[PDB]
Design a protein around this ligand. Structure first.
Ligand code: HEM
Ligand SMILES: [Fe+3]
Length: 403
């Protein structure tokens, strides 16, 4: 297996065959990188947690040797042409960047947000129940607009702007035209920049306001840093969630017995959302690291300066922790999944995500119980060649009845 990673996700109900055969060989294997390099590939679940929690495996893209797995040469160069992202800093510097935002995702904080989320979901579910289309693309009706608007709600954009925020955000993930996206971000970075300025003078009940207040009361303002935060949040939480919604439906639909459980008792939904996250693990290899020291792990001696890639999808399908990992079992209480990562960088909005999905799945199947795929499974175009797994478009329908 001189194989060169990454390997495309060809089947949405089983990870690349090569992945399993790699784990069967060892918890950690040195692999070939299509990008040209070479790096360590962690397939074992225990080792996955190990590295992701071990600070010796840096996430700083400013370091020579950082793996070009999910990164371009140009993408790496861009990151080295601006301040580091939270997703790219270590220890103290990281902590300092995360502490001031941890509060925006507490149980209480997110609790007050719930209603706003429900309303957004209900709205689009409505728009669906009134479409003049035979088949409807669940991706453009639900998947995309929901996470984006939920986030702008969080940041604090006025309701009177949802349409704008929805169109630019949606285009920033456009499939065609590298310029449309560029033009999308552009118009947004402008909106957000001024929106914040407005907030500085007469705030409200949003993240922006609360942030501007802390910086003032604490040390001093950082307009750019705040503008940067907004995008970090939108960026790391829009497509991931969207794709999770898409795959969540397809997964639930392709497993009736499981869908009935969720549809029968909504209290079982939260645990179902966890199984769905493990099952698909759409962030698979975004957890690339750069060893800054020599480390003995997984029975392998990793030398400093070498790249380390943690495969979350591989860890979440590790049979040594998840009995029959190949089966979609909403019932299993198997905690410890890594779809959200592990360690210092574990997903900051993992709970906002859990909330969205939970609300989306319940509402969707409660309001449109007979929802089914408008086309055969093999026809649904999955984003199997994308860094973050998902589905390009998902045609669907339901039964319009009479009494
Ligand atoms: C919906 C599915 C989502 C998945 C699967 C997901 C997954 C992840 C993963 C795996 C990481 C760690 C990456 C690494 O360590 O290199 C991460 C980080 C992060 N995610 Fe998400 N995420 C999701 C949604 C969100 C949402 C909704 C937000 C909030 C807007 C969010 C905010 C973040 C932030 C800020 C980080 C960086 C944390 C840090 O640097 O310490 N994520 N996410
Ligand atoms: Fe009726």
């Amino acid at each position: 297996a001189g194989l060169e990673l990454p390997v495309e996700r060809g089947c949405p109900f089983a990870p690349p065959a090569a992945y399993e055969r790699l784990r069967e060989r060892a918890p950690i294997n040195k692999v070939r990188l299509t990008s040209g390099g070479q790096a360590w590939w962690v397939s074992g679940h225990e080792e996955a947690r190990a590295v992701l929690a071990d600070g010796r495996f840096s996430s700083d893209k400013r370091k020579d040797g950082f793996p070009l797995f999910t990164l371009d040469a140009a993408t790496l160069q861009q990151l080295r042409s601006q301040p580091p992202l939270m997703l790219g800093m270590d220890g103290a510097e990281h902590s300092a960047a995360r502490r001031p935002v941890i509060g925006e995702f507490t149980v209480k904080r997110l609790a007050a947000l719930r209603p706003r989320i429900q309303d957004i979901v209900d709205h689009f579910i409505d728009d669906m129940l009134a479409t003049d289309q035979r088949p409807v693309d669940l991706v453009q009706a639900l998947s995309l607009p929901v996470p984006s608007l939920v986030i702008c709600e969080l940041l604090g954009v006025p309701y009177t702007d949802h349409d704008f925020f929805q169109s630019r955000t949606t285009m920033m993930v456009s499939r065609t035209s590298m310029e449309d996206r560029r033009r999308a971000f552009a118009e947004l970075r402008a909106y957000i920049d001024d929106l914040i300025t407005r907030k500085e003078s007469e705030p409200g009940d949003d993240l922006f306001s609360r942030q501007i207040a802390r910086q003032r009361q604490e040390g001093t303002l950082d307009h750019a840093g705040l503008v940067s935060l907004a995008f970090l949040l939108l960026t790391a939480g829009h497509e991931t969630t969207a794709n999770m919604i898409s795959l969540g439906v397809v997964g639930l639909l392709s497993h009736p017995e499981q869908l009935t459980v969720v549809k029968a008792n909504p209290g079982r939904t939260p645990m179902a959302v966890e199984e769905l996250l493990r099952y698909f693990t759409i962030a698979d290899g975004v957890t690339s690291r750069l060893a800054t020291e020599d480390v003995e792990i997984g029975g392998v001696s990793i030398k400093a300066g070498e790249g380390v890639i943690v495969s979350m999808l591989s860890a979440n399908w590790d049979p040594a922790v998840f009995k029959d990992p190949a089966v979609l079992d909403v019932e299993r209480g198997a905690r410890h999944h890594l779809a959200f990562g592990f360690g210092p960088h574990q997903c900051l909005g993992q709970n906002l995500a859990r909330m969205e999905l939970q609300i989306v799945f319940d509402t969707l199947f409660r309001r449109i119980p007979s929802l089914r795929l408008a086309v055969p499974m093999e026809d649904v175009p999955f984003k199997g060649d994308s860094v973050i797994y998902g589905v390009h478009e998902l045609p669907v329908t339901w039964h319009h009845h009479h009494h």
